[PDB]
Every structure is written in C-alpha cells, then in structure tokens.
C-alpha cells in the first residue's frame, strides 16, 4: 500500500523486535553490577515497554553503561515509531480531506 502505511507498520514490527532484544540485552548488561534490578527477563520486558512509551515509572532502570545504551535504543525506537504513526495518520487525513473539499 501507500509508503507511510508501509513505514508505520514496519515501525511496529521493528519496535516489537527492539522490545524483545532490548529486554534480553538489558539483563545481559546489568547482571554483574551490584545493586542492579533489571536482571530477570519478565520485568525487563515490562521495563522496555514503559521506556519505549516514555512513561518511565522509575520502578526499574539500568545502572550500567551498556544497559543504559540499550535503554537509549529502546527509547528512540519507541519514539520514532510513534512519530511515524502520527505522520502516517496525518497523511491519510490530509490526502483524505483533499477529497471532501
């Protein structure tokens, strides 16, 4: 279909991948750092979900260099994909209004 939809869908699929990879990689980077809490996979997936959406409750977060980098990748992927859905909707609404007018 139209490019924007292809870009929006693609940057959902990619986001889901980043959530799983970002969840597996955060546990890998954080174990070994005394005091770290992002160390088991289930809560790490929850952590990534609340990071990508930018809600960030503060119940869990990375304390190591690599865990933080992973965090930045998760943030950008989520923000980027949401900005791509908004842009795709605007295109659909704009192109659609050109008709109603």
């Amino acid at each position: 279909s139209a490019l924007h939809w292809r870009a929006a869908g693609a940057a959902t699929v990619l986001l889901v991948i980043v959530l799983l990879a970002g969840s597996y990689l955060a546990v890998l980077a954080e174990r070994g750092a005394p005091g770290a809490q992002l160390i088991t996979y289930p809560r790490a997936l929850w952590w990534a979900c609340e990071t990508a959406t930018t809600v960030x409750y503060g119940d869990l977060y990375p304390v190591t260099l690599w865990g933080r980098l992973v965090a930045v990748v998760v943030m950008v992927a989520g923000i980027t994909s949401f900005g791509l859905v908004t842009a795709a909707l605007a295109t659909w609404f704009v192109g659609r209004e050109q008709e109603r007018r």
Epitope: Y24, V27, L28, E30, R31, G32, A33, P34, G35, A36, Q37, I39, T40, Y41, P42
Partner: antibody
C-alpha cells in the same frame, strides 16, 4: 530424566587446578543461566557465579576470592567451571543449577564432591 | 548486597503441628524470595517461588507468605519427611544471595 549431570567427585592436590562439568538436558532456551553454588560440610549455600551459555558471558561473587572461571559449550550443552590454585578451604560439594532468567533455581545437579589433599 | 537472615537456626516442632520459618531481608525486595529444601546428603529442591507461588510436585502442606523485608515459609502439620535444612534466596538485586538456613527438627 536428570536435567543436570555432574561427576560424583574430584580429587585435587593443593595448588593444582581441576575443571568441573555440568551436562544439561531437557528444554534449553536462550534465556537460560547456569549457576554454581559452593557448599562446605556442615555449612550453607554460597553462590559462586553464573554464565549464560547462549552468549558466553559470566559473572562472579565479588565478596569472595575469585577461584573460578566459567565457560560453556553450546554444541555439547555443557557448562564448565575451572577452579585454580586450590587449598583445603576449597574442599566442598559444588552444585550447578539452572535458572530460566526468572530468578529461581528450578533444578540442581547432584553435585561434585571436591577434596583438596596430597 | 542483600543480606538474608534466617533465625532461628534450628526449629523443633511436635509431629503434626504447624511450623513457620522466617527470612528477613536487609532491604525491601518485593516478593522476589524463593525457598529451597535440602535433606541430608541431598541437593537443594525448589519449594516455593516468589514468596508464595506453589511448584508442581510439592505437597500442598507447604505455603509461603510475605513481601518487602519479612518472609515466612509455613508447613501445615509437619511430618518426618520434612526433616531437612531450609534456605531462602532472593533475586530482587544482583547478586542473588542465600539465607544462612534453618534446620527442621521434630520431637517424637
């Protein structure tokens, strides 16, 4: 069937080094971590370290002197623990255990009795 | 690193009575506590996970409760096969750590 198989025992001379093994069976996931626990007679469980075979990274108990070195073999599904320059202080039963990345030790090996003596 | 205190070190109960093991953490760890049973010459065996979740194959007699810093492992009506050492283990913060242990002793 026995999920984790370990050799019943190992004799080591003071100052030498031995390598323990832990052959895994049953379901294996990318999120599995293999742990090693040291237990001296009459005492409790002391965590030594862990390793994630799928990636090869390992971590160790900082509170104690580092006598171990962990490695894994994906093809033979075997986790190994190398103990070096031992003394009688290192004589104990060494257990391996499997954790599915969710914090608890679902299953343990029978344990290898290590004795350091000339 | 989180210190897990198990006191008393030995507990004596009469056959059939209700017994309770205590585990105290040096800081709040939610419900990230797990219990293990180790009989004489045996390897540890998972009894209860996440403070209160049951494992399959474990007698209904065993139960756990608590959250935060205080945890309890309970056995409704203890029997001879329950004679063993009991350990708690936390997974809230790295590195995982074990309590020192409580020995269950029965008075017959």
């Amino acid at each position: 069937q026995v999920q984790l198989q370990q050799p019943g025992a190992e004799l080591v001379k003071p100052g030498a080094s031995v390598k323990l093994s832990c052959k895994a069976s049953g379901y294996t996931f990318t999120s599995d971590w293999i742990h090693w626990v040291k237990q001296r007679p009459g005492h409790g469980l002391e965590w030594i370290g862990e390793i994630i075979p799928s990636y090869g990274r390992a971590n160790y108990n900082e509170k104690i002197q580092k006598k171990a070195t962990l490695t894994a073999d994906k093809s033979s599904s075997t986790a190994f623990m190398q103990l070096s320059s031992l003394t009688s202080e290192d004589s104990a039963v060494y257990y391996c255990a499997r954790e599915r990345g969710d914090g608890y030790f679902a299953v343990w090996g029978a344990g290898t009795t290590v004795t350091v003596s000339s | 690193d989180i210190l897990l205190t198990q006191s008393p070190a030995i507990l004596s109960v009469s056959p059939g009575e209700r017994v309770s093991f205590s585990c105290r953490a040096s800081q709040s760890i939610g419900t990230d506590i797990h219990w293990y049973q180790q009989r004489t010459n045996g390897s540890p065996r998972l009894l209860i996970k996440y403070a209160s979740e049951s494992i399959s194959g474990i007698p209904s007699r065993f139960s756990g409760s608590g959250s935060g810093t205080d945890f309890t492992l309970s056995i409704n009506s203890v029997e001879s096969e329950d004679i063993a050492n009991y350990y708690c283990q936390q997974s809230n913060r790295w590195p995982f750590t074990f309590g020192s242990g409580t020995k269950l002793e029965i008075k017959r």
